[PDB]
Structures are given as structure tokens and as C-alpha cells.
Amino acid sequence: ESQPDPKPDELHKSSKFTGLMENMKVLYDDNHVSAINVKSIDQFLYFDLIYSIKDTKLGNYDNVRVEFKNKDLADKYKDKYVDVFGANYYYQCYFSKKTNDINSHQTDKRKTCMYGGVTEHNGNQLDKYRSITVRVFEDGKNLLSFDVQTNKKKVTAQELDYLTRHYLVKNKKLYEFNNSPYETGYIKFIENENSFWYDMMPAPGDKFDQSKYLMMYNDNKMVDSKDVKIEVYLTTKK
């Protein structure tokens, strides 16, 4: 089944967001969580899992809390080896680790947080990368198309959304420090006779809540990388 295209729920307008657009841009910039074949090492609340994933590139985190929509999802992946991929946040992130009074001077642990992004490792690997075409519509016209790549058979929508928006930040300035050249944007995922979409712009007002925005990924929704198609619909600002 297909989510109706926007107009019920009309889209967020970037011109009515008066906060710092950088706080959206940073979620789809170069840095993101990516780990292959890792297992949970702890749990804070009953609907999350904690991973020791080090930020080898900048060391901004050593531990990542992954939050899910419900207990069933955390139970499904607990203690199993998985791949993790997603957009992380810091300012609103908190968790405690249950290391049983720990030792070895745990100290100086650097934390970050995310939602969903988890797929089983075993069985889900392709030998060679798969390409997925993204068609971009600007004011109704398809003026740009490009591909994103994944090595997973079942892939989260979060991973594909990140890769799509990363290209558009770098090449079409989708988000800038204090504005966007686009008024509205949505990303649409098509998988056989199912389709769904996400609003790409922040809610109006002077503050952007990163955690609430990223919470949409807590369903861990997945698509089959061989069947999915991506469309992006942007409208330009006056």
C-alpha cells in the first residue's frame, strides 16, 4: 500500500524555520555511524541497545546508544552480530552504562545516540555493491539523477536517506549554515506496490529538535535493495 503523497500533512516550509539550519545539515554531512559485524555490549532502557563503536576518524564517540520503537526490536538484535548505519546526535543524548560498577577506570567515555539503523550481519551481505538510482525533481522536472550504493540485501530506509541527502548537501546545497535554497522537500521510497515518504525540512520556529526529527527512524524500517527506487521532490524558494 502507498502513503498518499503530501497535501494531507502539507510540507514544512524552510522559509518559516528561523533557527540554525546547520543543526539539520550536520545530520547529513560527512560524519555518520557505520559499523560492520558488531554485537551489543549493554542496554540502558528496555527498547535500546548499546554498542562499542569507535569514531576512528575523529574519536568523537566510543559508545553508541541505538534506540528502537519498542521492546520487540531490541530483543530481536540483542547479543547478535549486526551492521549499524545511521545519523547520530549528541546535544540531547544521554544514557548510562551497566558495567556492574566497572573497573579499569572506564572514565572518559564519549557517547552518541541514534535511532534504528540495524540489520543482521550474517546472511545479509552482497558480494558486490548494489546501485540504487535516485531521481531528483526540482519544481516538477527531473533535472538530476544519481546512484547510491549499499552492500546489504535488506537495507534500512535510514541508510538510503542519509546517502541520498549527503549527495544533495554536497552537490545541490540542500542545507546550508543558515538557510536552504529549497522551500519544501520530501524523499519517497518505492518498493513494489508499497511507498512511503519523509519530509526533509525542519518544523517552523526558532529551534530544531534533532532528537525528535531523527526519531522517525526508530521503526528500523527496511527495504529490499534490489526492488527499491528513490524519488526526491524539491521546490525552489521564491
Side-chain angles (χ1 to χ4, degrees), residues 7-30:
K7 232 318 265 51
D9 50 22
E10 79 174 350
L11 292 174
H12 289 156
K13 292 180 186 36
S14 70
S15 58
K16 304 222 206 174
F17 170 69
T18 59
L20 221 223
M21 188 67 73
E22 192 76 348
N23 282 334
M24 169 72 89
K25 179 172 182 278
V26 65
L27 302 178
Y28 299 102
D29 222 299
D30 288 347

Side-chain angles (χ1 to χ4, degrees), residues 38-96 108 110-152:
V38 289
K39 173 179 95 51
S40 61
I41 59 160
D42 206 350
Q43 172 168 59
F44 181 44
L45 309 179
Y46 66 89
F47 51 90
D48 70 50
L49 296 173
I50 298 165
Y51 294 86
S52 38
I53 298 168
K54 166 84 188 240
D55 177 5
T56 35
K57 171 195 195 257
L58 310 175
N60 277 323
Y61 53 84
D62 322 313
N63 289 285
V64 176
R65 174 191 187 214
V66 178
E67 186 180 330
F68 302 99
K69 172 188 37 172
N70 64 26
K71 183 173 174 280
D72 278 348
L73 281 164
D75 288 346
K76 180 178 188 285
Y77 296 114
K78 183 174 271 251
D79 282 325
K80 278 43 263 230
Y81 277 87
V82 304
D83 304 332
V84 186
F85 191 107
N88 57 304
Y89 64 100
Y90 299 90
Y91 168 53
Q92 294 163 287
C93 176
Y94 174 74
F95 54 95
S96 145
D108 61 15
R110 285 156 188 189
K111 294 158 189 192
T112 192
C113 289
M114 66 182 276
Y115 297 91
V118 171
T119 45
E120 304 192 356
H121 182 85
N122 290 327
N124 192 224
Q125 306 306 126
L126 297 167
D127 296 326
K128 292 182 169 113
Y129 72 87
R130 176 167 281 159
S131 287
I132 297 150
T133 295
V134 178
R135 290 183 72 217
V136 186
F137 300 82
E138 290 165 282
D139 302 321
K141 295 180 148 53
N142 177 29
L143 299 178
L144 165 77
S145 300
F146 66 95
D147 284 291
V148 298
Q149 286 123 287
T150 183
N151 273 91
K152 299 173 185 156

Side-chain angles (χ1 to χ4, degrees), residues 162-214:
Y162 168 84
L163 296 169
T164 295
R165 300 199 210 186
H166 180 81
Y167 184 91
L168 293 171
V169 168
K170 295 344 197 38
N171 291 288
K172 293 291 261 180
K173 295 168 261 342
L174 168 67
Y175 308 122
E176 303 195 276
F177 181 75
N178 56 192
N179 68 284
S180 170
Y182 299 103
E183 176 72 324
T184 68
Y186 62 107
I187 180 164
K188 184 180 180 176
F189 298 96
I190 306 92
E191 192 184 24
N192 303 306
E193 299 301 304
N194 196 57
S195 73
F196 57 97
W197 56 268
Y198 298 144
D199 189 335
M200 275 192 290
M201 294 293 183
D206 71 320
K207 296 147 185 307
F208 178 58
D209 184 335
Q210 291 175 327
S211 176
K212 180 143 185 233
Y213 185 79
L214 293 167

